[PDB]
From Swiss-Prot, chain A:
Key words of the record: Isopeptide bond, Phosphoprotein, Proteasome, Ubl conjugation
One Gene Ontology term of the molecular function aspect: enzyme regulator activity
Domain PCI: 1-108
Task of the protein: Component of the 26S proteasome, a multiprotein complex involved in the ATP-dependent degradation of ubiquitinated proteins. This complex plays a key role in the maintenance of protein homeostasis by removing misfolded or damaged proteins, which could impair cellular functions, and by removing proteins whose functions are no longer required. Therefore, the proteasome participates in numerous cellular processes, including cell cycle progression, apoptosis, or DNA damage repair.
Protein's name in the database: 26S proteasome non-ATPase regulatory subunit 3
Residues annotated with Phosphoserine modification: S61, S73
Family: Belongs to the proteasome subunit S3 family.
Curated annotation (Swiss-Prot), chain B:
Database matches in Pfam families: DSS1_SEM1
Described purpose of this protein according to its UniProt entry: Component of the 26S proteasome, a multiprotein complex involved in the ATP-dependent degradation of ubiquitinated proteins. This complex plays a key role in the maintenance of protein homeostasis by removing misfolded or damaged proteins, which could impair cellular functions, and by removing proteins whose functions are no longer required. Therefore, the proteasome participates in numerous cellular processes, including cell cycle progression, apoptosis, or DNA damage repair.
Taxonomic placement: Eukaryota, Metazoa, Chordata, Craniata, Vertebrata
Name of protein: 26S proteasome complex subunit SEM1
Superkingdom per UniProt: Eukaryota
Record keywords: Nucleus, Proteasome
SMART domains for this protein: DSS1_SEM1
UniProt organism field: Homo sapiens
Swiss-Prot record, chain C:
Covalent link location (Glycyl lysine isopeptide (Lys-Gly) (interchain with G-Cter in SUMO2)): K63
Species this protein is from: Homo sapiens
Assembly and interaction partners: Component of the 19S proteasome regulatory particle complex. The 26S proteasome consists of a 20S core particle (CP) and two 19S regulatory subunits (RP). The regulatory particle is made of a lid composed of 9 subunits including PSMD8, a base containing 6 ATPases and few additional components. Interacts with DDI2. Interacts with TASOR.
Top-level taxon of origin: Eukaryota
Family membership: Belongs to the proteasome subunit S14 family.
Biological role stated in the UniProt entry: Component of the 26S proteasome, a multiprotein complex involved in the ATP-dependent degradation of ubiquitinated proteins. This complex plays a key role in the maintenance of protein homeostasis by removing misfolded or damaged proteins, which could impair cellular functions, and by removing proteins whose functions are no longer required. Therefore, the proteasome participates in numerous cellular processes, including cell cycle progression, apoptosis, or DNA damage repair.
Protein name per its UniProtKB record: 26S proteasome non-ATPase regulatory subunit 8
UniProtKB/Swiss-Prot annotation, chain D:
Task performed by this protein: Component of the 26S proteasome, a multiprotein complex involved in the ATP-dependent degradation of ubiquitinated proteins. This complex plays a key role in the maintenance of protein homeostasis by removing misfolded or damaged proteins, which could impair cellular functions, and by removing proteins whose functions are no longer required. Therefore, the proteasome participates in numerous cellular processes, including cell cycle progression, apoptosis, or DNA damage repair.
The family this protein is said to belong to: Belongs to the peptidase M67A family.
Recorded name of the encoding gene: PSMD7
Additional free-text comment from the UniProt record: Does not bind a metal ion.
Oligomeric and partner information: Component of the 19S proteasome regulatory particle complex. The 26S proteasome consists of a 20S core particle (CP) and two 19S regulatory subunits (RP). The regulatory particle is made of a lid composed of 9 subunits including PSMD7, a base containing 6 ATPases and few additional components. Within the complex, PSMD7 interacts with subunit PSMD4 through their respective MPN domain. Interacts with TRIM5.
Natural source organism: Homo sapiens
Protein's recorded name: 26S proteasome non-ATPase regulatory subunit 7
Complete-protein stretch covered: 196 to 260 of 324
Lineage, uppermost ranks: Eukaryota, Metazoa, Chordata, Craniata, Vertebrata
Record PTM N6-acetyllysine, positions in chain: K9, K19
Disulfide bridge positions per record: none
Length: 140, 40, 116, 65, 94
């Protein structure tokens, strides 16, 4: 129960809700020794919050996503999106005047590319089990 | 296991996975969406 | 604060530290942050104004941003900086990988013959 | 098909070069270059001129894989 | 003459060699369709004339030398990678 509502505050980007979970439910976390992540999980949730918005919208403005994710300032938003591009999280282009962020739909992943290339690992996974069944059959 | 370390230390439950998304987001909601009628 | 990033909040916390002896390391903490202004901010932004980049770099008109105009290259514009051209290098990415796609079918058809 | 296909390729292309040297006639004529140019619908030379057949190359391997 | 393709051709190139005006390129290349030297349909959006098949005529001493360059090149390229098909896949056959 103390560890339950935690992930329920991870799905949301509210700071007041996330910090209240750490205060009340932090006692249960002491026995687990999981406190290492609580400092870096704040940076994890802000990536989930921006991924929720970036996947739901074509263009997302920095000023509109500012208070919606409550970054509260334009300057640190330029620092987050910069590191989001460094981590390959977001494809969004940014037009700096005030500024604002203007992105576009990413495509061309298509069909002929990803599924057949992933199927190389799928069949190589399956054909090995054919040997695993033969090896297990040889003992009896 | 029971060996080694670990011994030392429809239903509504299934819908509760989605239902908790209603708790932290947009309530249910009737009243607010019912108040939006006369707003604009 | 390095994940904010800071820049700003670090230097405000750099005002009061016990520390003690951190004075030598916060100078190296500078250089590892200072070279990130060029690395982090782009790619990719369009154009950022002159004094906007100076707000993070502090000073007044240092030779560091002058060294950036050399190192980055990138662009030195009047009263502004540009990312031309464009945003940058315009990746296609390549029409060559159609080759290696035929290479993937080589060993893939071979795995179908291994069973057989 | 590569062996027997490209060996007669080399045997004839060496005799076709021999034409200018000696053994002329055969001029031939004209049957030699005529159907060779029918072979020329695709050369295929550098590099493969498959820009239109590139996406179609893997697209034929699409469902087979 | 060229190895092409480089199959579809731009009207300005026909307007260079054949030195014909843009409005007359239609009658030009489409009449060759009935003669039978080329069957290639014409792309009239960019006004580029596409070619199909080919009409060979005679031969020259530079054509044989030009042949051995671009003919045997098909022989040396395919047989080189054909050995790669023989090399790796001879084990799964035996």
């Amino acid at each position: 129960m103390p560890y339950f509502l935690l992930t329920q505050a991870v799905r949301t980007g509210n700071l007041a809700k996330f910090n209240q979970v750490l205060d009340q439910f932090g006692e249960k976390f002491q026995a687990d020794g999981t406190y290492t992540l609580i400092i870096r999980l704040r940076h994890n949730v802000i990536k989930t919050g921006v991924r929720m918005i970036s996947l739901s919208y074509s263009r997302i403005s920095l000023a509109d996503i500012a208070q919606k994710l409550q970054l509260d300032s334009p300057e640190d938003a330029e620092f987050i999106v910069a590191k989001a591009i460094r981590d390959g999280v977001i494809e969004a282009s940014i037009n700096h005047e005030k500024g604002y962020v203007q992105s576009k739909e990413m495509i061309d992943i298509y069909s002929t590319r990803e599924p057949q290339l992933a199927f190389h690992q799928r069949i190589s996974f399956c054909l090995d089990i054919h040997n695993m069944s033969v090896k297990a059959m040889r003992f009896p | 296991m029971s060996e080694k370390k670990q011994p030392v230390d429809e239903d509504n439950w299934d819908d509760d996975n989605v239902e908790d998304d209603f708790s932290n987001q947009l309530r249910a909601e009737l009243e607010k969406h019912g108040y939006k009628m006369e707003t604009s | 604060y390095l994940m904010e990033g800071s820049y700003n909040k670090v230097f405000l916390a750099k005002g009061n530290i016990p520390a003690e002896s951190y004075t030598f390391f916060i100078d190296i903490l500078l250089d590892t942050i200072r070279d990130e202004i060029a690395g982090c901010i782009e790619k990719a932004y369009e154009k950022i104004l002159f004094t906007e980049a100076t707000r993070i770099l502090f000073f007044n008109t240092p030779k560091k941003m002058t060294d950036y105009a050399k190192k980055r290259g990138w662009v030195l514009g009047p009263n502004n900086y540009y990312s031309f051209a464009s945003q940058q290098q315009k990746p296609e990415d390549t029409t060559i990988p159609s080759t290696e796609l035929a290479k993937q079918v080589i060993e893939y058809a071979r795995q179908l013959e291994m069973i057989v | 098909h590569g062996l027997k296909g490209l060996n007669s390729k080399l045997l004839d292309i060496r005799s076709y070069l021999e034409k200018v040297a000696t053994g002329k006639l055969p001029i031939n004529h004209q049957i030699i270059y005529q159907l060779q140019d029918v072979f020329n619908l695709l050369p295929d030379v550098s590099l493969q001129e498959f820009v239109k057949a590139f996406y179609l190359k893997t697209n034929d391997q699409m469902v087979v894989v | 003459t060229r190895p092409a393709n480089h199959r579809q051709l731009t009207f300005e190139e026909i307007a260079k060699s054949a030195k014909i005006t843009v409005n007359e390129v239609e009658l030009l290349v489409m009449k060759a369709l009935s003669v039978g030297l080329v069957k290639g349909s014409i792309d009239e959006v960019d006004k580029r004339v596409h070619m199909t098949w080919v009409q060979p005529r005679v031969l020259d001493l530079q054509q044989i030398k030009g042949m051995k360059d671009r003919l045997e090149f098909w022989c040396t390229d395919v047989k080189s990678m054909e050995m790669l098909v023989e090399h790796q896949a001879h084990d799964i056959l035996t």
